[PDB]
RNA sequence: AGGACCGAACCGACUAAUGUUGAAAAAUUAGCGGAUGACUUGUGGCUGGGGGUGAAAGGCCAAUCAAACCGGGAGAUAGCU
RNA sequence: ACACAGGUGGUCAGGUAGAGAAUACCAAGGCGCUUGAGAGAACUCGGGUGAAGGAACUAGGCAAAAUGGUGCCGUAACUUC
RNA sequence: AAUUCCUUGUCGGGUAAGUUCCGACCUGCACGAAUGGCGUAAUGAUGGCCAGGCUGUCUCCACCCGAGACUCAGUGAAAU
RNA sequence: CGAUGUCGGCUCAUCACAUCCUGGGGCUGAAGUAGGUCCCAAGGGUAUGGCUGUUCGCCAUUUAAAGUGGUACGCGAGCUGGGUUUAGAACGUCGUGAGACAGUUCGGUCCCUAUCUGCCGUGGGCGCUGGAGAACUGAGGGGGGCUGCUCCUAGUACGAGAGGACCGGAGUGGACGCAUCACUGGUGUUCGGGUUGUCAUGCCAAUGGCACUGCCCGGUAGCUAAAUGCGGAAGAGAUAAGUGCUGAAAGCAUCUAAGCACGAAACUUGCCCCGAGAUGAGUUCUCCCUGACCCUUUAAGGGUCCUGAAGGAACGUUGAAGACGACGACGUUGAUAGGCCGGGUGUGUAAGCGCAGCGAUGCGUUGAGCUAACCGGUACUAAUGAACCGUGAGGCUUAACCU
């Protein structure tokens, strides 16, 4: 559960460490991302080196939510906190290039494969 | 005596 | 085709090889006898009449009871019509089984919503909450403005507003058919059917594809 | 309710041994890796049980790679296969909840050693 | 809105409530028949029988238990003594329940509650 | 908010038409003493279903 | 030492909700300011109506104020209703 | 104008904790406020808790929420020191 | 600008985005020197703007405890 | 003008169509993707934020889209009170001055218990032609009607390239809606525990009161959304613009004048719900009543004795039903509620006694003790034998069967 504002952390290099949603992209009025969901993004804090810089507007990939996961047979993946993928503005696809904590099954994707090749776990 | 509306202002000005 | 009266003993999860949760009302259905057939001879349509449980003596009036009377009796808790279409049956307590959705895959069930019994709007018709402050003045969940001005001069039929809520009929539609078992007259419908615990049930091969 | 039961013992895991919270269990879940139908497994300490038969579940706390991961299995879940329990929890309290607040150093749990 | 809850309200608060049907279990348990609103009444029965349950097995622990409710030490004595052996046989259903009706005051709806074998 | 015009006498019978009381009808007859009462209720000397409880 | 500091009594009246045929013709509750001073208080005194008093708002002078109240001229006058 | 949640100067002042005439629980003493009894709807008033989010509310963070003690360590611009 | 109509002037800053705000320019419609000019530490229930914390203020409302509202008994108003 | 409250927001709406999106078309300077424009279409849908009092507008970022209008520029006896607009104050400005400004600037009380209409709910009465219990028929009314993206078709048609389809499938979403508590959780002042201050139960030990439930950690049922099921359809009829077939008037041509076929989220249906006060008061099944007698102005006439049914209501115990009525379960031939038994769930190892220890405390007995609304059981208590209401064969006419 995700939301405009809400900062999350960034599970990636590029530089970002903490990053607030502007917009829960997919649809009218969609209120929450969450799971493995899109998000455009405004960086806020940003480290010196970096892809990215501080005031920059990207997308990003939901990676933990807080309020984590159900899938199927009834049982729960939470993580304590809310951290996300930077992803190019065009491409989606990952502006990084290592991943950091456990991320999910459910980001099994075809554009999200890059970040479960990387990451250490589920 | 007077009702507190009819003594009041703002209420009672309502359209110049 | 036609379908069956049961009741809902309710609600539980049946685990899967593969490792999935099925939740599942479950309803028990025991046999319905139909205690009456219909007819475009005796006038209008084609249907027939069950009822299904059991009933105290006391409690059997005497009408009641003469018209269980044509027919195998045993007075059981109500009686219900469904529409027949080109299948048959004769009254001599045909008794039906949950066999009958032995092959369904649908169903489509129905029951009485819990009684909410007043609710008002915010509830009833999740109209939106005016500001818990700001200097609202007793107004935090009313339902503000309900016309227009002069020209309306008056307020439209069915305006949305406060009142009885919940404890009518409501059905549900669709539902995939987990589980049909005979000797045990059990049911499992795929999740959540309407009314409460042990209330009275109607279930029908869904209507719709 | 005794029409259920009856559906609900007849799927219940018997092999369950004992937990408890505090316990260090792990819990090996079956997984659809990709290709592969792997076992992985989930070690942590068991901060809260159900205790509801058939729908029994239960919370393990981790602390991977940073900061905590949470997941309740549902005890009687095919999912699960295999869950032994590897170290023993002095705690007293029924729901860990408070470790949550704590890290590391902060957070380790007495043997319970009896 | 209530669907299976359990418990009256009797227009007090939880407090006032817990306190009242403590005097009154003892004012029960004491004179065996007392005269209260119906309402009252009926409450009454789930703070007392289970009192008297509680006592048809004497030990230390029984009594001061039974002493952290009632809190006077000579109801806990007339329990276990008197009360708890007096129905130590008896399923349930200590006390009944009798109807007068119509308080002349607040037109209260009344009834006597009584201990079942009060004979006397 | 007031009326715009006086209600009439009429009306006001009309309003009251459902504010009439009922009688009793249920009242029963004690097996031992003689006693009218209350179904359910104790009579007025302590009689209930023919048993004699409360001395008052 | 202090028109010094934090803070009850005491003196104030910045915000809000309630109340608005009130519990109350101006208060209640929660917060708020001052609190050894140009402080605050009991009793008693003096100032009178184009006059008083006013750290000044046209404020206050007995629930009345850009001229108090009571009686009088008096049935003012009213090309208005 | 009321058996009115207001106003009314002086005097006395116990225990436990406390800096305290704050505050909480008590003593001496004094009270339960002159309609009650049931119900456990909407709504209104006054309170308590809340998943994930955290000012996105709104004229405005209005209101709520938060801070809150004592000792020690430590504390920037600026400064009339 | 407590003074600027034109005006959301123009430039710089802060924001993803700023008719407000901070810093400037000077084209001051219509500042200006005891109906004082320009500054100013400290003080302010003073006005405008920002941030951390905080949260039912909001997304979007859920449940609960109490006082009314509802039912019975007694008393018994109001404006129009 | 013996008062017709006013910008903007909020809440709630409702119509129009000069249609923003979705649907169907003609033309295109229509290759394709995609546009333009006109016609038909009002079923549904139709953005969160920055700034400002704004509406608006600009900007950020979305979206299939962010439609234009009417409704006292809808909506203050619904809310707000930021703007304009009360007495205070200042700036600039005008004025000798009091003062003044569509100049600006900081500060200020929005009352009303709903008689009527309307509207959302919910009962009472009578009717419906003997009375009564059910189950129905469905005139009629209301509800619902949105849409993205990916994959396959297919890198095919088309196109020099770049790019990239119709049509038809399959999944999976957004917003919305109904239902439900199995899961995940919120609440849980009626369960258990920890803990501060103090008072009390004589004291130790153990407990209770008060301090917001004193503070707080968990938490049963219930109620619930963030939780998880389901829905919009398919189909059918008749059409809109539009396209046709055949075809004369008019030897030809022509969709039309006769005749025939296509044709859209609009229309009538299909789906869900209400519904015989449908006074046009309908249908079906079942149950109940088979006594005497008098008076007159002698007729759907009035009355007396007997009789009192089916059923209903009342009363009682009551419910996931409920404001009150109402609706459902049950009343001893009984599980209706409470209690009680066993279990579960929660909490998390009671008290007592022992051991160790100087003691705080630890351990053993002990996963103990306690445990609401849950589950399965159980007549211990309370649901009385009765009374009450309701009757005693049910109008005239005509027709058809039979006597
Ligand atoms: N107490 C009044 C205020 C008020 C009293 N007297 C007045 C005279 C005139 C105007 C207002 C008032 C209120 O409800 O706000
Ligand atoms: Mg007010
Ligand atoms: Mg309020
Ligand atoms: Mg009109
Ligand atoms: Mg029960
Ligand atoms: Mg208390
Ligand atoms: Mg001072
Ligand atoms: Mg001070
Ligand atoms: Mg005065
Ligand atoms: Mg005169
Ligand atoms: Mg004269
Ligand atoms: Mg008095
Ligand atoms: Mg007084
Ligand atoms: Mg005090
Ligand atoms: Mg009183
Ligand atoms: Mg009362
Ligand atoms: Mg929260
Ligand atoms: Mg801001
Ligand atoms: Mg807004
Ligand atoms: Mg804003
Ligand atoms: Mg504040
Ligand atoms: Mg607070
Ligand atoms: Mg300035
Ligand atoms: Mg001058
Ligand atoms: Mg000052
Ligand atoms: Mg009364
Ligand atoms: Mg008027
Ligand atoms: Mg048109
Ligand atoms: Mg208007
Ligand atoms: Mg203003
Ligand atoms: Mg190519
Ligand atoms: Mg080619
Ligand atoms: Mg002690």
Request: hydrophobic residues 35%.
């Amino acid at each position: 559960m995700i939301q405009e504002q809400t900062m999350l952390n960034v599970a990636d290099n590029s530089g970002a460490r903490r990053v607030m949603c502007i917009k829960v992209l997919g649809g009218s009025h969609r209120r929450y991302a969450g799971v493995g969901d899109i998000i455009k993004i405004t960086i806020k804090e940003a480290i010196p080196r970096g892809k990215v810089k501080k005031g920059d507007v990207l997308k990003a990939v939901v990676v933990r939510t807080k309020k984590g996961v159900r899938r199927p047979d009834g049982s729960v993946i939470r993580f304590d906190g809310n951290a996300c993928v930077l992803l190019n503005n065009n491409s989606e696809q990952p502006i990084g290039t290592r991943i950091f904590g456990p991320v999910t099954r459910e980001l099994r994707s075809e554009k999200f494969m890059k970040i479960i090749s990387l990451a250490p776990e589920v | 005596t007077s009702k507190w509306f009819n003594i009041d202002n703002k209420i009672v000005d309502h359209r110049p | 085709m036609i379908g069956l009266v049961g009741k809902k003993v309710g609600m539980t999860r049946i685990f899967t090889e593969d490792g999935v949760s099925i939740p599942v009302t479950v309803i028990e259905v025991e046999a319905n006898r139909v205690t009456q057939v219909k007819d475009l001879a005796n006038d209008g349509y084609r249907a027939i009449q069950v009822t299904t449980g059991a009933k105290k003596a006391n409690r059997v009036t005497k009408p009641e009871a003469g018209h269980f009377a044509k027919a195998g009796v045993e007075a059981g808790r109500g009686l219900w019509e469904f529409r027949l279409a080109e299948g048959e049956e004769f009254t001599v307590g045909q008794s039906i089984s949950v066999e009958l959705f032995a092959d369904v895959k649908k169903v489509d069930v129905t029951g009485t919503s819990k009684g909410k019994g007043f609710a008002g709007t915010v509830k009833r018709w999740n109209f939106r909450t005016q500001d818990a402050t700001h200097g609202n003045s007793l107004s935090h969940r009313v339902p503000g403005s309900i016309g227009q001005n002069q020209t309306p001069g008056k307020v439209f039929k069915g305006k949305k507003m406060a009142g009885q809520m919940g404890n009518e009929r409501v059905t549900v539609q669709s539902l995939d058919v987990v589980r049909v078992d005979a000797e045990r007259n059990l049911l499992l419908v795929k999740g959540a059917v309407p009314g409460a615990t042990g209330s009275d049930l109607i279930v029908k091969p869904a209507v719709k594809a | 309710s005794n029409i259920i039961k009856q559906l609900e013992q007849e799927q219940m895991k018997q092999d369950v041994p004992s937990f408890r919270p505090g316990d260090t269990v792990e819990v090996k879940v079956w997984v659809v890796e990709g290709s592969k139908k792997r076992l992985q497994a989930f070690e942590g300490v068991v901060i809260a049980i159900r205790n509801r038969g058939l729908h029994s579940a239960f919370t393990v706390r981790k602390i991977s790679n940073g900061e905590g991961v949470e997941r309740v299995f549902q005890t009687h879940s095919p999912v699960v296969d295999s869950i032994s329990v590897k170290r023993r929890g002095a705690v007293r309290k029924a729901k860990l909840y408070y470790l949550r607040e704590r890290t590391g150093k902060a957070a380790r749990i007495k043997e319970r050693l009896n | 809105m209530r669907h299976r809850k359990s418990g009256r309200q009797l227009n007090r608060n939880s407090s006032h409530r817990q306190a009242m049907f403590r005097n009154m279990a003892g004012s029960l348990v004491r004179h065996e028949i007392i005269k209260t609103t119906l309402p009252k009444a009926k409450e009454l029965r789930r703070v007392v029988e289970p009192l008297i349950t509680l006592a048809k097995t004497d030990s230390v622990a029984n009594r001061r238990l039974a002493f952290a409710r009632t809190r006077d030490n000579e109801i806990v004595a007339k329990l276990f003594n008197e009360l708890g052996p007096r129905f130590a046989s008896r399923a349930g259903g200590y006390t009944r329940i009798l109807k007068c009706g119509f308080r002349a005051g607040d037109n209260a709806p009344m009834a006597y509650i009584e201990l079942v074998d009060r004979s006397e | 908010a007031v009326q715009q015009n006086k209600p009439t006498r009429s009306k006001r019978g009309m309003r009251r038409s459902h504010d009439a009381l009922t009688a009793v009808t249920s009242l029963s007859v004690d097996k031992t003493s003689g006693e009218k009462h209350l179904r359910h209720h104790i009579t007025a000397d302590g009689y209930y279903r023919g048993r004699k409880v409360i001395a008052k």
